[PDB]
């Protein structure tokens with residue numbers, strides 16, 4: 183089977199310019215497990231990004247949580263970029279703090 | 282509320298390397314407490330929860346030893362599955378297993394669980410009677426018979442009803458302070474235009490534990506089902522979770538919609554609207 | 558406490 187990944191970009195705590203927070207990207211519902219995930223700052227891949235270890239849910243689909251420590255600013259735009267066999271091309275999702 | 286232990290095991294075959302990658306992860310009340318990765322430099326179960334630190338060397342050797350045994354089982358099964366489905370070599374395949382036991386608030390057994398999946402689809406699962414099986418498809422039929430003939434079920438039912446429950450009791454007693462806590466939801470509503478004369482309201486729930494929660498939108502007493510989107514509960518990163526429910530409302534008549542948040546950590550359900 | 562599997566698939 184092949185299940186396209188579900189992606190959510192969000193900050194651990196509600197964002198606050200100048201206040202240290204955490205930027206998460208929860209990639210879930212996918213299968214097989216081979217998946218590529220990056221967090222972007224102004225369109226560039228962030229180097230120091232950690233993630234949880236592979237896991238799966240009841241429906242057998244896999245899920246990971248990618249995260250980085252960061253300080254939100256008004257103009258800095260964040261995003262998550264996901265690649266997976268089910269995607270014809272990298273799927274980018276922009277962070278929307280006021281969602 | 283109820284409790285449970287689970288072991289989520291995955292094996293992924295891969296071209297060239299005759300050894301599949303194996304990852305086992307155990308949970309208690311849905312919290313990861315131990316973990317084994319065959320790709321690590323020195324394969325061995327590792328405590329993933331703080332209350333697992335008190336377990337001595339004998340404990341980890343026994344656990345790691347089983348993981349090593351599991352690798353071989355998965356290595357072999359993957360091989361057989363590749364034959365049951367007449368698939369060709371030089372590829373990558375996934376075999377998964379879920380095991381565990383559910384306990385009621387009284388710490389007594391509710392359910393025994395044991396099922397497998399191949400390529401992400403149900404293959405064979407032990408029925409709730411812990412005596413018979415369900416083979417999701419033709420190939421699994423071959424496996425149901427082999428196991429009915431061997432009487433495997435009796436072995437698992439033994440583990441599920443005995444060792445599973447006993448050890449789950451302990452982990453609950455040891456991780457008491459952490460596992461049995463409850464963090465109530467913190468709610469608020471957001472507003473966003475959607476279309477002409479349309480509006481999107483979003484009921485947010487942040488910082489709660491456990492992850493189970495219910496979010497509803499309603500128009501003057503009736504509950505809403507249409508144009509109502511419920512996003513997937515997600516981890517915050519600090520051990521609490523978040524979720525939200527959105528509903529499309531006709532511009533202007535927004536205060537007429539209200540949402541409620543239900544969670545076991547809440548004396549009474551939260552009730553809120555979009556307050557401008 | 559993990560389980561250990563008996564007969565291969």
Ligand SMILES: *[C@@H]1O[C@H](CO)[C@@H](O)[C@H](O)[C@H]1NC(C)=O
Nearest residue numbers: 350351354436560561562563
């Ligand atoms: C655990 O599984 C192995 C094979 O995976 C089996 O040989 C062993 O008997 C099982 N443990 C027990 C106590 O039966």
